[PDB]
From a paper:
We investigated the importance of difference parameters by engineering masked antibodies based on the well-characterized therapeutic antibody trastuzumab (Herceptin), which was used as a model. Three antibody fragments with affinity for trastuzumab were selected as anti-idiotypic masks, based on two single-chain variable fragments (scFv40 and scFv69) and one nanobody (dAb), previously developed and characterized by the Navarro-Teulon group.
To elucidate which specific regions of the dAb and trastuzumab contribute to the measured affinities and HDX-MS protection, a crystal structure was determined at 2.35 Å resolution. The model shows a single T-dAb Fab fusion in the asymmetric unit. Examination of the interface reveals the main dAb:T Fab interactions are located in CDR L2 and CDR H3 on trastuzumab and CDR1 and CDR3 in the dAb. In this case, dAb has a very slow dissociation rate (koff = (5.76 ± 0.08) x 10−5 s−1, Figure 2e), and therefore it comes off very rarely (half-life of dissociation is 3.3 hours), which does not provide many opportunities for HER2 to bind, especially over the time course of the incubation with SK-BR-3 cells.
Residue numbers in the entry:
A (entry chain H): 1 to 221
B (entry chain L): 2 to 26, 28 to 123, 155 to 368
């Protein structure tokens, strides 16, 4: 089965350069067109560029013309998006997708996305504190608990619970921009009252931009 | 349900044969298509016709020569073949609910085959509405107008929070493999509609139409579809600062408002009965793909010192699902 995996997003200084990788598995990139499509935060979808990896014939959106370069390496079955002359309007999640079909084209398979933040500011790993389950955080057999992920830049942080064994009743809130200019978000989970004390609760925070991986253990009050 | 093909024969190169497929079981809501197969070699796709006939598409080797028609009243799908080459010599199969897969085509129903022997001797997509909200099992429609003719080079994509856009409809009216039958696409010149017939709590998303008729392929405004549910009150919980956070000079106090509907809730902080302002930050989650609820976190951020000044730290919540305001609190220093 066809799979497009991306790598190389994150923080990049204005004016600077960032090269995104799109690794393809389950097909040859020589058979189809590979694309890059972006999405500004809370905005719609923008087609960036495209390549026909066979001959290397590219096509770009005026918005990225002369600045970004789409290129492929068939030997590796990977397509690339080298971003140069980086402006703030370029801050977006960057997806790659292919055009698959028989007697038609359609972006059937996409990449997972990678957020690119164009900022002069510096990277900062988060500070994780437990939001410990209390009797003031219990209501009719359902106990809530969580994790505070304060002071990090840029986005994103990803929170998983018990290494992904716990997914039900999880709510990792969107991040809030503080006065500092740093982001902070919570991630909460509601578990049964019987489970506290007998079951271990750990939140797995990952700030890829500054390679931070923290596994804070949430114990009761 | 059975599909029965009729019309195959021996033909000389450059002749013209029509194949009929009688579907008995209804068929008018699904895509009908034709496959072909040469013995010893895997079965390959030929042509497809969307449920309403809006759009068709043909494998490159038959484009311009073959024509797929459909009679919804006569329960028939036809294949008008023309200028037949000897390489068209195969067993022609007729199929029901033919959909692209990413590796080829799939179908729900298959015919028995009829042998055929050929003997040698800048465009903008204007989406409407931008926001939409409806109850479960309501029929919703997203109308998207092309600036100039784009034929049927139009695809419908659903995007949910956090994740990448997913392909729902292709070639204006064709369903991709996996997509539930409640979604149907339609074309009328430049106007392309998407119809989710029996709206579900997992259809919460932003949908975009897209034209790939020219370069650049262009997307529409999108449509955030909100799923309505019954008024549901929040479960309010209160979280004091950890001792870890207090070692530094700050104290964050989070108030959780779990799983509520509608999204409008009001949260007031009180510190020793003293109502707080401009010292708290809010964040609301995106509606649930399962129960259509929202959740909200109000964080009260103060200094280590100020937290040590006061006693009671209360969170006061107001919502439709409540007859009265919910207050959750704690006293600093008590177990």
């Amino acid at each position: 089965e066809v799979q497009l995996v991306e790598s190389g997003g994150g923080l990049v200084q204005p004016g600077g350069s960032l090269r995104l990788s799109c690794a393809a598995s389950g097909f040859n990139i020589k058979d189809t067109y590979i694309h890059w499509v972006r999405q500004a935060p809370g905005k719609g979808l923008e087609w960036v560029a495209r390549i026909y990896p066979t001959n290397g014939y590219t096509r770009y959106a005026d918005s990225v013309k002369g600045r970004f370069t789409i290129s492929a390496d068939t030997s590796k079955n990977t397509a690339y998006l080298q971003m140069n002359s980086l402006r703030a309007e370029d801050t977006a999640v960057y997806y790659c997708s292919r055009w698959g079909g028989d007697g038609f084209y359609a972006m059937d398979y996409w990449g997972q996305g990678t957020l690119v933040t164009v900022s002069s500011a510096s990277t900062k790993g988060p500070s994780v504190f437990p939001l410990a389950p209390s009797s003031k955080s219990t209501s009719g057999g359902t106990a809530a608990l969580g994790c505070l992920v304060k002071d990090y830049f840029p986005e994103p942080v990803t929170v998983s619970w018990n290494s992904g064994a716990l997914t039900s009743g999880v709510h990792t809130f969107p991040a809030v921009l503080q006065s500092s200019g740093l982001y902070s978000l919570s991630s909460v989970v509601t578990v049964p009252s019987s489970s506290l004390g007998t079951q271990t609760y750990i939140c797995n925070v990952n700030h890829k931009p500054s390679n931070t991986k923290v596994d804070k253990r949430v114990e009761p009050k | 349900v059975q599909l029965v093909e009729s019309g195959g024969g021996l033909v000389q190169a450059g002749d013209s044969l029509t194949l009929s497929c009688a579907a008995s079981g209804t068929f008018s809501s699904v895509a009908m298509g034709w496959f072909r197969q040469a013995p010893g070699k895997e079965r390959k796709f030929v042509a497809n016709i969307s449920w309403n006939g809006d759009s068709t598409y043909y494998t490159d080797s038959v484009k311009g020569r073959f024509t797929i028609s459909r009679d919804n009243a006569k329960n028939t799908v036809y294949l008008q073949m023309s200028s037949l080459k000897p390489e068209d010599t195969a067993v022609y199969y007729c199929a029901a609910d033919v959909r692209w897969t990413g590796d080829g085509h799939r179908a729900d129903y298959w015919g028995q085959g009829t042998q055929v022997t050929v003997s040698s001797g800048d465009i903008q997509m204007t989406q409407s509405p931008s926001s939409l909200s409806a109850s479960v099992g309501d029929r919703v429609t997203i109308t998207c107008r092309a600036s100039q003719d784009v034929n049927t080079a139009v695809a419908w994509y659903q995007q949910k929070p956090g994740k990448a856009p997913k392909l729902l409809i292709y070639s204006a009216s064709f369903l991709y493999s996996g997509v539930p039958s409640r979604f149907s696409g339609s074309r009328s010149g430049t106007d392309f509609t998407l119809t989710i017939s029996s709206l579900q709590p997992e259809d919460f998303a932003t949908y975009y139409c897209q034209q790939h008729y020219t370069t650049p392929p262009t997307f529409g405004q999108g449509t955030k579809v909100e799923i309505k549910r019954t008024v549901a009150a929040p479960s309010v919980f209160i979280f004091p600062p950890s001792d870890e956070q207090l070692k530094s000079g700050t104290a964050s106090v989070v108030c959780l408002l779990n799983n509520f509907y509608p999204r409008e809730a009001k949260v007031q902080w009180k510190v020793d009965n003293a109502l707080q302002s401009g010292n708290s930050q809010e964040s609301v989650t995106e509606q649930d793909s399962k129960d259509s609820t929202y959740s909200l976190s109000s964080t009260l951020t103060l200094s280590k010192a100020d937290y040590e000044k006061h006693k009671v730290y209360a969170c006061e919540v107001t919502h439709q699902g409540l007859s009265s305001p919910v207050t959750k609190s704690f006293n600093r220093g008590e177990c």
